[PDB]
């Protein structure tokens, strides 16, 4: 059945130290801490430590390990990075790049007027560019997320937004659990079809999440009713004071016909100029890899 083969990603648990908890995960408590020599020319690094509770069986601890391993394949500045693993011995761990600000959704709800500035067009274009960049990288690497949502993106100390670690199981498909209707494309709801295009659809919804400081998409309607609405050409409303240009993107990512929607590279291409100066140096888009 299940088995985990140790590899070069292994790290000595003596190099890892946990200061405090960040939050409960699917397999157990997630902590914050420090790891030595997990980054090039970096003696120590602050990291996120995912663990599995003692109550966990072998299969679970192994499943935890094989799931975290999907991230071994990826290396993008705009995708949260795996830094190591501790499979040998009890407190099965996984060391991840630390995103001090949490998931994008929680970060957006945090600016809720209920005293910092909301996000300005400039700020939003940045997050969108970063998210689109990590998605273009992933799609370029034959992977279809299938569960892109603000809650699945993470925010770094310097406010850089990245795509959180994911699970997996031709184009590989991510996604795990009961997929949420409010982020699904019409063709996904109708035929169960997932593509780079339906990832773009979901992208438009997170732009809408951003623009609404994370309101519930199709708020007021049941998922059951959303299923039909969306399949019927129904779309989300233009947020109260949403920048025209921002809503333009949304509308294009929401073309009923998948082929009519832009790719993440085309999304980026059309907003790259409104990106920060550093983008050119860290982006997949401007990387040698993109071609």
Ligand X SMILES: Nc1ncnc2c1ncn2[C@@H]1O[C@H](COP(=O)(O)OP(=O)(O)NP(=O)(O)O)[C@@H](O)[C@H]1O
d(CA 19, CA 21): 7
Please work out, in degrees rounded to the nearest 5, the angle formed at the alpha carbon of residue 149 by the alpha carbons of 78 and 252: 90
d(CA 153, CA 205): 13
Which of 16, 35, 71, 80 is in the footprint of ligand X by CB under 6 A? 80
CB of 212 to ligand X, least distance (A): 21
According to DSSP H, which parts of 235-275 are helical?
Answer: 244-253, 264-269
Query: What is residue 165's DSSP assignment?
Result: P
Do 4 and 66 contact (CB within 8 A), yes or no? yes
The residue range among 8-16, 84-92, 99-107, 242-250 that interacts with ligand X, by the rule CB under 6 A, is 99-107
d(CA 242, CA 248): 10
Q: With CA atoms as reference, report the closest residue to 67 among 50, 53, 79, 44.
A: 50
Instruction: Give the footprint of ligand X on residues 240-259 (CB under 6 A).
Output: none
Do 53 and 92 contact (CB within 8 A), yes or no? no
Instruction: Give the footprint of ligand X on residues 110-169 (CB under 6 A).
Output: 154
Which of 4, 15, 17, 25 is in the footprint of ligand X by CB under 6 A? 25
The residue range among 96-104, 129-137, 138-146, 250-258 that interacts with ligand X, by the rule CB under 6 A, is 96-104
80 or 86, CB closer to ligand X? Answer: 80
- Please count the other Cβ atoms lying within 10 Å of the Cβ belonging to residue 26: 14
d(CA 82, CA 93): 11
Q: Is 65 in the site for ligand X (CB under 6 A)?
A: no
Q: Is 6 in the site for ligand X (CB under 6 A)?
A: no
CB of 161 to ligand X, least distance (A): 12
CB of 202 to ligand X, least distance (A): 16
Phi, psi (deg, nearest 5) at residue 79: -135, 130
Which of 11, 18, 30, 86 is in the footprint of ligand X by CB under 6 A? 30
Which of 98, 138, 140, 205 is in the footprint of ligand X by CB under 6 A? 98
The residue range among 3-11, 19-27, 226-234, 257-265 that interacts with ligand X, by the rule CB under 6 A, is 19-27
Q: Is 99 in the site for ligand X (CB under 6 A)?
A: yes
Encoding tokens for residue 61? Answer: 């601890």
Residues recognised as catalytic? 147
CB of 244 to ligand X, least distance (A): 33
Instruction: Give the interface with ligand X as residue ranges (CB under 6 A).
Output: 22-23, 25-27, 30, 48, 50, 80, 96-99, 102-103, 154, 176
């Amino acid at each position: 059945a299940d088995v985990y083969v140790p590899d070069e990603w292994e790290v000595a648990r003596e190099k890892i130290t946990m200061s405090r908890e960040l939050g409960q995960g699917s397999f157990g408590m997630v902590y914050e801490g420090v790891a030595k020599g997990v980054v090039k020319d970096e003696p120590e690094t602050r990291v996120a430590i995912k663990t599995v509770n003692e109550a966990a069986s072998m299969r679970e601890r192994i499943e935890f390990l094989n799931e975290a391993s999907v991230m071994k394949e990826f290396n993008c500045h705009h995708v949260v990075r795996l830094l190591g693993v501790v499979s040998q011995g009890q407190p099965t761990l996984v060391i991840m790049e630390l995103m001090t600000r949490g998931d994008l959704k929680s970060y957006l709800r945090s600016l809720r007027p209920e005293v910092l500035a909301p996000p300005s067009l400039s700020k939003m274009i940045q997050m969108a560019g970063e998210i689109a960049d990590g998605m273009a990288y992933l799609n370029a690497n034959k992977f279809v997320h299938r569960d892109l949502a603000a809650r699945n993106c993470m925010v770094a100390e310097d406010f850089t937004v990245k795509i959180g670690d994911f699970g997996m199981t031709y184009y590989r498909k991510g996604g795990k659990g009961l997929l949420p209707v409010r982020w699904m494309s019409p063709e996904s709801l109708k035929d169960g079809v997932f593509t780079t295009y339906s990832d773009v659809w979901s992208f438009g919804v997170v732009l809408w999440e951003i623009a609404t400081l994370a309101e519930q998409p199709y708020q007021g309607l049941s998922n059951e009713q959303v299923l039909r609405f969306v399949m019927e050409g129904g779309l989300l409303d233009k947020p109260d004071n949403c920048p025209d240009m921002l809503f333009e993107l949304m509308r294009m990512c929401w073309q009923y016909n998948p082929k009519m929607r832009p790719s993440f590279l085309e999304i980026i291409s059309s907003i790259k100029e409104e990106m920060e100066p550093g983008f050119r140096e860290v982006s997949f888009y401007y990387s040698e890899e993109n071609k």
